[PDB]
Amino acid sequence: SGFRKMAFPSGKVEGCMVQVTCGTTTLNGLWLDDVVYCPRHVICTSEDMLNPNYEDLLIRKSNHNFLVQAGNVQLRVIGHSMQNCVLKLKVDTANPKTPKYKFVRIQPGQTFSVLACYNGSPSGVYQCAMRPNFTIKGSFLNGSCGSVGFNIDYDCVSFCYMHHMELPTGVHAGTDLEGNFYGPFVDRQTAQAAGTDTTITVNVLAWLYAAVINGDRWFLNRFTTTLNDFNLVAMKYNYEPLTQDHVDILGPLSAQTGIAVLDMCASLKELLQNGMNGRTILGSALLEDEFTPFDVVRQCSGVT
Amino acid sequence: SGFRKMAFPSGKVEGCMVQVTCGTTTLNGLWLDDVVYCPRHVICTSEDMLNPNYEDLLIRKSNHNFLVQAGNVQLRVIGHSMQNCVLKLKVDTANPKTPKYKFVRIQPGQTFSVLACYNGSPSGVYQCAMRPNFTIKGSFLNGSCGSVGFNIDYDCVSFCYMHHMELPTGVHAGTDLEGNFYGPFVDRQTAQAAGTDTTITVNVLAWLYAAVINGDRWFLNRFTTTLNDFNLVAMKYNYEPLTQDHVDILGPLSAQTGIAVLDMCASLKELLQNGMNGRTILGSALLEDEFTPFDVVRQCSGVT
Ligand SMILES: Cc1ccncc1NC(=O)CCc1cccc(Cl)c1
Ligand SMILES: Cc1ccncc1NC(=O)CCc1cccc(Cl)c1
């Protein structure tokens, strides 16, 4: 009973957080095995930020210039390299708390947990999604760079995001753990506007199924629709077009509830056209799109 | 930038979760030092549930009937006792991962993180609040009993909740770590209806301050009000009455933003009387009440 915006238990990732300081800048790093991963902008000053040449700035840095601290103890840096927008600091000690892990590059619509950190110390955990415009709507202040996003499959942590920047509009941009930014963002203090933040249709439908499973059924109607008809409505409301791949992934939710995917689309179409009329669904007065079909199945079944 | 429903990092609590089985019932337990805390209804069958005499049922149980497993290894139970609605199983081994901790009994309006668990294994973490009717709106399935609620002050975990039951309305009830239920609930499968779930006014105001700090300012108006005038409106809308204690706790938010507490009350009064008009505040189309003034300061300042 009940349905909450739930994050993964953060302990496995907490054991990886370290502090990285270069010159006068301090941010977070991720220590896995004998490598510490952090945003390459740790080497920049408040003058380099406008148009930094990272390869040139890195020439002036040696292993001893990167101060890496895990708790109250210092790690010895024995190598460093730049991979895309991240730095990989080789240390002389493998992290004894290294969990089983993978580096994954997620697609828009996919959700993940963020362990926000400051000075290598975890402050909180929340759930968010890679938006269709490749931004994330996080909660990050100065010092949070290097905080990571991840998913967990039983004992394996799949790291998908590293925090690098805040756009002038208060939304967030970052990279995968290979240092490649999601979307067109660059690690520079320049004009970077985000595209249309469309709604993740498949996630809204998954959340409507979660609502039905939890007893909120007022929005179920006597109608059905087609993918093409539904998509005309989705385009009008800045919703992502629904594909047969999305219909297929909603199969287990349709099977559990007995509500055909296209019938749920017709309920969503009416909600888009008529609004909620001051009513709520799972404690929300808007259509929630940061639960994937997999998240709904996981939470509704109790996967650990 | 950004404001999220953020939970505490769960690692310190993950290290305390164990599985407790008695007869054919399995739920979660909390292992701190050499004691494992769990709901006393672990001793009940699906016949005892209607009207259990716990003292009588416990007479038929010995130390060896409580199976306690921490990961894949079994703990030896050398004592057991009942304290209110919880059982305390003394084990022969102190939990090596015991964090610094306290047991606190929270008041309605206070928020905490929940680490939902099944079979002693953590499934997720979310944030919630002790409602004014002493229920919590969680996400719990069968097997989640014994999952705990907590707050963290730097290195000390303050445990405030242990999950015991779901009411027929899908809301949740439980105890503090001394085994005393919040509210009038009893650990019995009987008719237990919840009282009015009023809105936590001081938390809504704190969240309006968080919105202003994060740039969502459309709701700020040219009006002010008094505590008595505001409270007439709060009563009409099933909001908790605001006191000078609440005004005082909002002082730091008023000081940071320069918006007098009574001016923010007047903005909230207009939002109650006029609605949101299809607009949003911090990504919500309703007034959020599960962030305390302390939560807002913490998240807006980056406390670790
Ligand atoms: C201030 C803040 C808040 C939240 N998340 C992240 C941040 N920080 C930033 O955006 C840093 C911007 C930057 C880019 C490239 C070089 C340099 Cl020196 C700085
Ligand atoms: C099924 C569920 C779902 C979520 N949270 C909790 C639960 N479980 C319950 O409410 C258990 C009710 C109970 C009370 C006293 C004795 C016995 Cl045998 C059972």
Which residues of B are known to be catalytic? Answer: 41, 145
Whether B282 contacts B288, CB under 8 Å:
yes
| Residues B93 and B193 occupy one common structural domain | no
Q: Express the helix, strand and coil content of chain A in percent, nearest 5 each.
A: 25, 30, 45
Chosen domain end from A99, A127, A148: A99
Tell me how far apart the alpha carbons of residues A122 and A30 are, in angstroms, rounded to a whole number.
12
DSSP 8-class letter at B274: H
Residue listed under structure tokens 């002036």: A60
Residue B303: helix, strand or coil by DSSP?
Answer: coil
Smallest CA separation from ligand 1 atom 18, residue:
A49
The experimental technique behind this entry is X-ray
Structural domain of residue A71, as residue ranges? Answer: 15-99
The token pair at B204 is 């809504």
Distance B29 CA to ligand 2 centre (A): 15
Beta bridge partners of A22: A25, A66
| Mode of pairing for the β-strands spanning A17-22 and A100-103 | unpaired
Spell out the alpha helix ranges (H) of A175-292.
Answer: 201-213, 227-236, 244-249, 251-257, 261-274
Q: Are residues A4 and A137 in the same domain?
A: yes
Distance CA A90, CA B4 (A): 34
- CA dist., res. A168 & res. A186, Å (int): 13
Q: Is A140 in the pocket of ligand 1 (CB under 6 A)?
A: yes
SS3 content of chain B, % helix, strand, coil (to 5): 25, 30, 45
In chain B, the number of structural domains is 3
CATH code for the domain in which residue A80 is found: 2.40.10.10
Nearest residue to A174 (alpha-carbon basis) of A53, A54, A41, A55: A41
* Token pair 């990092």: residue: B9
Q: A130 and A264: one domain?
A: no
A50 lines ligand 1 (CB under 6 A): no
Among A98, A143, A137, residue whose Cα is nearest residue A118? A143
- Residue after which a domain boundary falls, among B67, B99, B131: B99
Q: Are residues B41 and B140 in the same domain?
A: no
Domain boundary at A49, A65, A99, which?
A99
Cβ distance A144 to B302 less than 8 Å, yes or no, reads yes
Q: Where are the beta strands (DSSP E) in B62-110?
A: 66-70, 73-75, 77-83, 86-91, 100-103
Atom of ligand 2 nearest to the CA of B45: 18
Strand runs labelled E in B84-222: 86-91, 100-103, 111-118, 121-129, 148-153, 156-166, 172-175
Distance between CA atoms of A180 and A164, rounded to whole angstroms? 11
Same domain, A94 and A171: no
Amino acid at A295: D
Looking at the fold, whether A111 and A70 belong to one and the same domain comes out as: no
Is residue B296 domain-shared with residue B211, that is, in the same domain? yes
Q: Are residues A294 and A205 in the same domain?
A: yes
In this structure, are residues B114 and B148 in contact, taking their beta carbons and an 8 Å threshold?
yes
Cα dihedral B102, B177, B121, B289, rounded to 10, equals: -80
DSSP labels, A199-229? B-HHHHHHHHHHHHHTT--TT--S----HHH
Domain of residue A266, CATH code = 1.10.1840.10
Q: Is B88 exposed, middle or buried, given 0-12, 13-18 or 19+ CB atoms closer than 10 A?
A: middle
Residues A238, A188: one domain?
Answer: no
| Alpha carbons A140 and A151: distance in angstroms, whole number | 19
Q: What are φ and ψ of residue B32, in 5° steps?
A: -130, 125
Residues A176, A205, single domain; the answer is no
- Closest of B140, B124, B126, B147 to residue B27, by C-alpha: B147
Distance B217 CA to ligand 2 centre (A): 44
Q: Ligand 1, from A38, A162, A165: best to mutate by most atoms within 8 Å of Cβ?
A: A165
**Cβ contact B173:B164 at 8 Å:** yes
Q: Residues of A with CB below 8 A from B280's CB?
A: 286
Which residues, at least 6 apart from B163, have a Cβ–Cβ distance to it below 8 Å? B39, B114, B138, B140, B144, B145, B146, B147, B148, B149, B172, B174
Is A8 in the same domain as A76? no
Q: Are residues B53 and B186 in the same domain?
A: no
